[PDB]
């Protein structure tokens, strides 16, 4: 199909490979850390969507150096893949308008 | 079947290091992790450390005199732990876990006897 | 870290009856508190995962209670087969901890 289509489904599937690759990470770089909480599999995962849509509720953060790169990772991807699926539908609206002119 | 297979025991003169091994069986997974918990007779469970064998990163308690180093073989699927230059504080029966990331240990060692005596 | 108190140290019940582990956390901890059993010359044992979850294998017996700082660890009718050493065990924060253990006597 289109561009803007194959794009949006491109970043969504992408997004979705940084939320479990990140949560994998965030573990890793977290435990050994004292006072870390974000250091087992589920709510890590919970927190990358969370850190990913941009909500952080502030339940769950990294308090390490890589924890902490790995999360701009995840904030960046989801903004991008978000901003990305707008970019797609303001396409869709645009080239519809165009239509209904001619 | 025994998930986890520990010797039953080791002799150690003070001063020297010994090697101790865990081998896992059983559903094993990237995610997996292999703890190590001491613990001297008549007393309770102490964390050691833990390793995540697919990545090989190692970390150990703090609070404590670090005795220990831990490595792992991913083709044997052994977990190592290496404790040196020992005293007659380090005797005592290691056990090696599993965690699957979740936070809690479904199946231990039968336990390691360490003795350390000339 | 997370310092997990066990106290009393030694609990002594009678055949039958209902019996209380206590578990305190220095710090709250929602429930990220796990039971296991340890009998004499035996691995530990685990009993109950997230204060509360059943353990395929243990038996019904067995039931745990709490969120926060505080825990309990139940056994509905107690016998025999229970007498031995009981942990408590955070995942909360790093590193994981273990309380001091509690001993059932019957």
């Known amino acids: 199909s289109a561009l803007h289509w194959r794009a949006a489904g491109a970043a969504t599937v992408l997004l979705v490979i940084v939320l479990l690759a990140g949560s994998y990470l965030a573990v890793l770089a977290e435990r050994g850390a004292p006072g870390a909480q974000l250091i087992t599999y589920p709510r890590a995962l919970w927190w990358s969507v969370e850190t990913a849509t941009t909500v952080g509720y502030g339940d769950l953060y990294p308090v390490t150096l890589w924890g902490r790169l790995v999360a701009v990772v995840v904030m960046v991807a989801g903004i991008t893949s978000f901003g990305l699926v707008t970019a797609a539908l303001a396409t869709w609206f645009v080239g519809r308008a165009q239509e209904r002119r001619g | 079947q025994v998930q986890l297979q520990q010797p039953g025991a080791e002799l150690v003169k003070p001063g020297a290091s010994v090697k101790l091994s865990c081998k896992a069986s059983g559903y094993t997974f990237t995610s997996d992790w292999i703890h190590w918990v001491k613990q001297r007779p008549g007393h309770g469970l102490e964390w050691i450390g833990e390793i995540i064998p697919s990545y090989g990163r190692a970390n150990y308690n703090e609070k404590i005199q670090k005795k220990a180093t831990l490595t792992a073989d991913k083709s044997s699927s052994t977990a190592f732990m290496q404790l040196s230059s020992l005293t007659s504080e380090d005797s005592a029966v290691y056990y090696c876990?599993?965690?699957?990331?979740?936070?809690?240990?479904?199946?231990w060692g039968a336990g390691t006897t360490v003795t350390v005596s000339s | 870290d997370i310092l997990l108190t066990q106290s009393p140290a030694i609990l002594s019940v009678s055949p039958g009856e209902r019996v209380s582990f206590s578990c305190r956390a220095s710090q709250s901890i929602g429930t990220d508190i796990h039971w296991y059993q340890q009998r004499t010359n035996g691995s530990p044992r685990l009993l109950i995962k997230?204060?509360?979850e059943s353990i395929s294998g243990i038996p019904s017996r067995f039931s745990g209670s709490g969120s926060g700082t505080d825990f309990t660890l139940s056994i509905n009718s107690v016998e025999s087969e229970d007498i031995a050493n009981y942990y408590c065990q955070q995942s909360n924060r790093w590193p994981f901890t273990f309380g001091s253990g509690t001993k059932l006597e019957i």
């Open positions: 997230y204060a509360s």
């Open positions: 876990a599993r965690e699957r990331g979740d936070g809690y240990f479904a199946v």
